[PDB]
Amino acid sequence: DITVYNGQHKEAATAVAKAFEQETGIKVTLNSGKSEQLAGQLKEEGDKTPADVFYTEQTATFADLSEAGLLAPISEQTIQQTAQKGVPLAPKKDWIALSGRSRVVVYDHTKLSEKDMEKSVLDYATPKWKGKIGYVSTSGAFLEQVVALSKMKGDKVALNWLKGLKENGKLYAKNSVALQAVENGEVPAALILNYYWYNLAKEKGVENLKSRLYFVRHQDPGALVSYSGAAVLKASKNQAEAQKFVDFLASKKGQEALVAARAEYPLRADVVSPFNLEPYEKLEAPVVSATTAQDKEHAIKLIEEAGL
Ligand SMILES: [Fe+3]
């Protein structure tokens, strides 16, 4: 039986954990928490941790754990299962990316069309969009978006974007509220995460929604994908079962269980989402280094300096 420290959404974790038990007979116990809290706890526990596997919504928490020497190598065969072009790869082969979530632009298709849309996320934070673009400054995904912009285009561009959103954007408390405002006719478009919209569409039928999705693509900062993944703890006294769980997550069946429970992009090339997501490769996600905590603190300074 194994212990999984779980930073991912509980419906995702529960659903892969149950398909695991069904396929192998091995019981999974989840210890859930925020990924950053869990990584800290895994570093304090060190070689005395009870964790066998760390399952996270964000692969960036792996870099420090790897560098601290706390992750076990994963099979090369397993790593190759999700190693599409653009997918982050552990240089020490000691964690694996499993699924992604994308930034998108949701729009009311009865007020705007694909041809009104912009080639860059940078273009939405300008006067042509005054009163017409929703954003959510308090979101974890928003913070990540800032970091990527800072890294790809430098700090002056990121700050200019944030100032533009302040001047021109409609601020919403959460991604789901932003979507509702677009559906309700309050704002014709917003910046959100893909899965809020696919969830609504799965539930309602696309033909009954005013809103549609525009993906920026061509490796723009607004095509940013954030990746979930897993690692085996080097200190686990149950390596065999831990490695079997991680291989299962990379397997066709494990990936099929994830995408049944949650509208993330599978990273296996032979699995299709029941939410009707495009193939990962069509996203043309940019290549961006991992978000450190210093990166997150930096983005918060830019958000503050912008009056947000
Ligand atoms: Fe959320």
Swiss-Prot record:
Result, substituting T14A: In strain: TN106
Variant or mutagenesis effect after changing I96V: In strain: TN106
PANTHER family: IRON-UTILIZATION PERIPLASMIC PROTEIN (PTHR30006:SF15), THIAMINE-BINDING PERIPLASMIC PROTEIN-RELATED (PTHR30006)
Entry protein name: Iron-utilization periplasmic protein
Record's keyword annotation contains Metal-binding: yes
Biological role stated in the UniProt entry: Part of the ABC transporter complex FbpABC (TC 3.A.1.10.1) involved in Fe(3+) ions import. This protein specifically binds Fe(3+) and is involved in its transmembrane transport.
Mutagenesis / variant outcome for changing T14V: In strain: PAK12085 and SB33
Annotated compartments: Periplasm
Amino-acid positions noted as binding Fe cation in the UniProt annotation, renumbered to this chain: H9, E57, Y195, Y196
